[PDB]
Each structure stands twice: as structure tokens, then as C-alpha cells.
Subunit: 160 residues, 6 copies
């Protein structure tokens, strides 16, 4: 299973990962986008992209009150970075890195469902800009060329 971490501003989480120490451990995440343009109209049906907030699941931890305060105050962070690393430890390839710029905590949903040794919560992030870098790998796990990159300035509706 892949290892997943998120760094939001200078907020410290409780990750004990060797290279992502004191970031937030990510248990799950989801994100998406859609385009309203249409190919059924012809003549040269232009639309726009809608980019969703990014959702992730974490343990309740020392970041929790800070994220709650960010959500309430509406104060944004300069950057948030979600790192997805291939299973096996800190020498493994960080093959998917999503970087968000101008980051608002749009929701926090917390609780204890019962019978749980570690409580979890869902956080959502709203942001002006997104970068996604994917690192292809060779058969042996080594890097295969440079990363494949996508960058989009949502606020200004142009590529980054």
C-alpha cells in the first residue's frame, strides 16, 4: 500500500515518517474536476473547467485545532502539499505530488464512530492554484525520465 502525507503551511501533524516527519498522515483522499465544453455543437461549444476542493482523511492529531481555526477564521495558507509514495519506505519514489497554492480549509468533519482506537476526521481544502507531478518508473522501481506535469491557475483560469 502507498504511503501518503500532507503538509499544510507550517502546521505540524504527528507523522513519524523518516522524511515526512511532523506532516499529517493521510488515510484517504479524493479530488476531481469537470469541463462544461461540448463537442456536439461544432462550428468552433466552449465551456469552462470546474475544479473541486480536495478532500482527505486523517487521524485527529495536533494539527486538528489549527485546521479548525483556519476554517473558522477563513485565513489561507500559502501552500499545501500532498505526497503519495510507493510502498516500501522513504527511499521509494514519490510518484504523485499535488501542490496547492493559496489554501483555505473549507471544512472539517470529525467524530468517533465507536470501537475505535484512533479517531479520524475529514478535511477539505479550497485553493487558487494546483500543480500535479507524476513520476513514471522503470520496471525495477527506478525513475523513468522526468516527471509528467500539470499546472492550473483556477483563480485566473489559465495554465500554470
Amino acid at each position: 500500500a502507498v504511503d501518503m502525507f500532507i503538509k499544510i503551511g507550517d502546521v505540524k501533524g504527528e507523522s513519524k515518517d523518516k522524511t515526512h516527519a511532523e506532516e499529517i498522515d493521510v488515510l484517504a483522499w479524493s479530488w476531481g474536476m469537470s469541463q462544461s465544453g461540448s463537442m456536439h455543437m461544432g462550428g468552433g461549444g466552449a465551456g469552462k473547467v470546474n475544479v473541486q476542493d480536495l478532500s482527505f482523511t486523517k487521524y485527529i492529531d495536533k494539527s486538528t485545532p489549527n485546521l479548525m481555526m483556519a476554517c473558522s477564521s477563513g485565513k489561507h495558507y500559502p501552500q499545501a502539499k500532498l505526497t503519495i509514495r510507493k510502498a516500501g519506505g522513504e527511499n521509494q519514489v514519490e510518484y504523485l505530488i499535488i501542490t496547492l497554492k493559496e489554501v483555505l480549509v473549507s471544512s472539517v468533519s470529525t467524530g468517533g464512530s465507536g470501537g475505535e482506537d484512533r479517531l479520524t476526521e475529514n478535511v477539505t481544502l479550497n485553493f487558487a492554484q494546483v500543480q500535479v507531478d507524476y513520476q513514471p518508473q522503470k520496471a525495477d522501481g527506478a525513475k523513468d525520465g522526468g516527471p509528467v506535469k500539470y499546472g492550473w491557475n483556477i483563480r485566473q483560469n489559465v495554465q500554470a
Copy 2:
């Protein structure tokens, strides 16, 4: 499993916990907030507001039940409620998450039973003017690591507390 308790005003529940005796045993709880602000506007614009949800919890039907029903019906508020979450293992284990509510209304009670059930359960929701959340980080050995990390918000006045 973590141990979870809620104290509502001076209402007595049936917890037999050494620390939280006569509080209410919490079986499950949920709470949340959201922010309508947007980063897609820019220029200093797109400001929003926080919406803080009621706190929901599940309890056994117990001696606090009729009192909670009266509070819900009358609309009378309690000065404070406090939800305590404690690491498994007993009364000297760390109470690592404590949520304190001020000016508290019982916004709903949903009760009943089935089975099979030897102990009936019910759901309660709480509406409140202010909230404090205190999280206590711990070292690898379980000892306290620094002081609590704190969040306080006055919902009524829409400012930090």
C-alpha cells in the same frame, strides 16, 4: 478503544467511570464546520463565513434522558457541556481531546429500541454559542508532549475565543 464521556450542565448520567462517574457515557459522536470563503476570486475578495454544526452524540437511555427531554422542550440552555475523549487503558490515561461548549441548548433527542437490545440507545444533538477544543499531544511512551493545542471560537459573535 478510546473512552468517551459528556457532562451537560449539572445533569447526572449513569457513567461508572472513576473520573467521570455520573456523567453520560458517549457511544459515538460527530461534529463539523465549513467555510463558504473561496480562493477562486482573488484581489482580496471572496470572503466567507464559518458555519459550525450542532454536536451529535449517542448515549444509552439513562437517568439523564428525561432531563435532556425537558431542556429540549423548554428551550432552556445549560451554562456548559464538556465532551472528554481519553486514550484506552483507564483513568490516568491522557484525556487528549476535550471539547467544551458554552451556552448549550439540547436541539434534538431521538430515542427508541428494538431487539434483542439489553440496553436501549438514543441520539442527542447540542447547539451552543461558543466552543473550545483542547488537544493534548503525547510522546511515544504516552507521556504528555508540551501543552495542549487550542482552538476557541465564539459562534455568536463570529470571533475567536
Copy 3:
């Protein structure tokens, strides 16, 4: 498991319970209330309570046609009493007693789902007034003080 019974007016059910003989056996029940008041407004956000109908599940039995007639005619009963008793028999503590006054049968939903040796149905009750008495117990099962009581006149919106 707790034993549960309901007595609606003078309607006879088929309970074979030693002390709740010829009441209706209750298989499940649900009930609730909500308050529209708000603590976010200050200045001294007053609202009102909404009390739900009480729902219960029973076997189809000799009360069934009488409850159907009550529902259709819209004729109310003076009282209905739901008794919840700790497991073990008729000497055990009746620890939750809900008494409803001016009682309308608001719905009856019946049928046979197939493969059933005993058919069941759901009934709902609408009422002007409610009393809820909870009897706390000591460690050995004996009563612990008097009952804890809640009474509300819905029709007139005041405590009972």
C-alpha cells in the same frame, strides 16, 4: 433483552405477560423531538419544540382491527402507556414508562414479507400530552431513589 408492552385505551392485545396480560407486545419503538431555538443569535433566538409521533412495531393481533378503525374514524383514546421493563420477568423494574394522553392512531402499516411464522405491523400515535418516567436502579437491580420525570403538554406548549 428488555420486555416491552403498550396499553392503548381499553383495547385488548394478546400479551401473555404475567402483569401486562392482554396488552400489546412491542417488538420495537422509536420517538423523538427537536427544538428550533438558536444559541448563535444572542441578545436574549427563541424557538419551539416539535414533538414527533411515537412509532412502534407489534404482531398482527386482536387489536389490529380496532387500531385500524381508530385510524379511519379519527377517534382518540384517553391514554396510551408504553412500558419498558428490564429483562427477567414481572418482578423486574419497569425502568422506562411513557404515557401519552389524547391519543390518535396516525398510521397503521401492515403486511407479510414472506417466510414469516408471525406477521408484524407498524403503528404510529399522535398525542396532546406526554409523560416520561425513568426509574434509576442500584447495582443489584433495586430501585435507586424516585423516578426521574419529564412531562409536556404539546397542545398548550407548557410543561405537565
Copy 4:
């Protein structure tokens, strides 16, 4: 399991029951009613009306199927239908719940199949002007206890029957 049968007009189904041969075998059924009256008004006010639902039942696709489809399509009503529920054990066991409908329209037929299925099933709903419900209580030994307990309602005229 109780044995369940429905007779609709003079339509023939494929039941092989000793008593209810050529009726329709009922696999499941549901029915209900509700009252819009309210006890929260008082003073003699807050009167309501009953709403009686159609009766739904499940049957095997059988020789009655095309006839039920024709009735549904034409809107032609049957004088009577009768649902009989009988305690398990055979034809001399007590028919403890009998529901008789008068002036009966087939309000829907939903049919089909899948699997796996050796016998296909379908759902039928019935709309009617009047209903009688007869319940027969029994002693501990299964013998009849007194006479049937009765409920009759004329939906069309909104009065007892």
C-alpha cells in the same frame, strides 16, 4: 410460515391449496392507512381524514397474469377480492386474517424475471372502494377464541362499513 392466498373476482390462478385451489398464491403483501388529524390543536379542532393505501402483493407469474393485465389496461373493476392468511399446518388451520375488498381495480402490474429463477414473480396493486378486515383470535391450543374482531370501512363514502 403462514399460508397466503388471494381471490380476485372470478379470475383463476394456479394455487394447488386444498381450500384455495385456483386462487393466486401470495408470496408477500403490504397495505396501510394514515390519518391527517392532529391532537396538537385541541378545542374540538384539528380534525383530519383517513388515507387508505392500495393493497400490494407479490405472486408467481401464472394463468391469472394476462387477465390482471387486461383489467389494469381496461380500468374494469371486479366486484370483490379476498386475501386470506392462514396459520401454518394446512387447510383446517385457522384463517386468522381475512381482508375483503369491494369494487376492485388493478392499479398496477410490475412483472419480469432474472436468474436463475425457475419461477418468475410479479407485483400487483389493488385499488378499492370498501374494505373489511376480519381477525380471528385463538386460544393457546390453536382453537378459536370468541368470534372474529372486525373492521369495515367505506373509503368512497368515508364512513364505517
Copy 5:
């Protein structure tokens, strides 16, 4: 389990059935109707029948592109016939036969859910007229009298 086949116009499917060769194999089907008339009104509450489209499930097969073209062009077939036969082979009684006249392919919903050796799709048919013939059988499986028949002209709202 019953054997099920459908013949739509002259469209060839891939059935290997001895008597329904090159029809479409049917994996499931559903159909229905409802009547808006009411018995609660008296005085002599007349309504109308609504007949649903017939839905069936099939394997993706050589009929698939033809059905897709019919759906897109909106061109109707003279007839479609759904045959349901008692388990055991081609000598067994075809006990339910549904014949549709003036047949439009109203939808095709296809795909592969993953892990499937044979892909399936759902088709719906809209039609002006329907015939349903049910063949009752004796205890030994032999025919019991003639078929029981239902015919309805939806387009003109009269029996067929």
C-alpha cells in the same frame, strides 16, 4: 431456470438455442403498467393505463451495433417477440410469449464492469401494441387448454 429469448425485427443475435437460433439470449427482463383510475370517487373516477417500455438484459453480441443504430435513427421494427420457455430444452412449453408491434429501441446501456468473461448491456423497447400469451400446463408438463391472452393497442387506447 427458464430459458429466455428475444427476436427484434430481422436482427440476428448469437443464440445457439436449437429452436431460437440466432435470436438474442435474454438474461433478465422487466416490464410494467399502471392505471390512474380511482374507486374512491364513485358516481360512475375513470382514468387511463400507462404502459412502460420493456427492459431486457443481453450479452453484447452481433445485434449490438444494429440496436444502437435503431436507437439513434429512431427507426422502428415491425415486431419484437420475447419468449420465456420452461427449463429443459426446446421441446418444453413456451409458457409466456410477449409480442410487441411497432418497436422503437428507446435506450441502450452498455459497458464492462471488470472481471467479466462476457460483457452485458441493457436495452429498452417502446412499442405501439402488446400481446401477452400465457400457456397453462398440467402436472406432467403437458399443455392445459388454450393460452390465456391479453392484447392492447397503446397507440389507440383499446384492446387488441
Copy 6:
């Protein structure tokens, strides 16, 4: 299980299939169309229109992901995409269903992960001006039976292609 692949423009995925290397491995897909015409009108009337849905498919997150995200964001279309479904058993088995899309927009990308998951997955939808569907029937032994059966539709112009 059938083998499923999609080629979108000249975008490279991570398939290691002998034939479809550098295409995208398809884990699941769905597509559909519907016709609003009605046979209940008659007289030559009740004509309708086809509505062709976007094509949805599931893929592993791979090197095509950022490119698909850029296409979705920019609204830039690809000349062609091709979904190939091949009978189980390898590269010389029959590619019995081939769907070719022309003028292709990436209408959505929904991505993420959980578990537990060693390989993360995502859903993609495609909007297109024209579609071709080629189905290749086979004999009992798996050899090709005649030529492909074909369907082509120009959605933009609402006519066959």
C-alpha cells in the same frame, strides 16, 4: 476476463500489453444512449432525437493522468480515442468490440485513493462529436465469423457516419 484498453490522442499510458503497450489499461467502462421518440403517437408523428452519453472509464493513476487533467482544464480536444475490448487469452485473440471516438474532450477526471490500495484508481469521462462501434462475431472455435458489424453516428450533425 476480457482485456480492455483505451488510446486517447497521442497520450501515453502505462499498459504493458504486447499490442496496446503505452495505451491506458481500462478497468471498467460504461456508455449509453437513449431515444425520446414514441410509438404511442402514430400517424407519422411522435418523432424524437437520440441523446448520446459521454463515455466513462476507470483507469489506474498513471503517466497519462496529468495530461488528461490538462485536457480537461484547457478544453482542448484530441482527434481520436479508441477503446478496444479483446477476448481473454492474449494478443492474437479477437478484438471483438472496438469503439472509436472522434473530436474528443476530457469531460471529467475524478481521482483519489484509500486503503490498502497498492495501485490508486481514477474515473475519466469523454465527450465526443462522432462515434464508431465495430463488433466482430466469432465461430464456435473462436475464428472470425464474417466481417465486423458496424455502427457509426455523427452526434454533432445528428446523422449516420
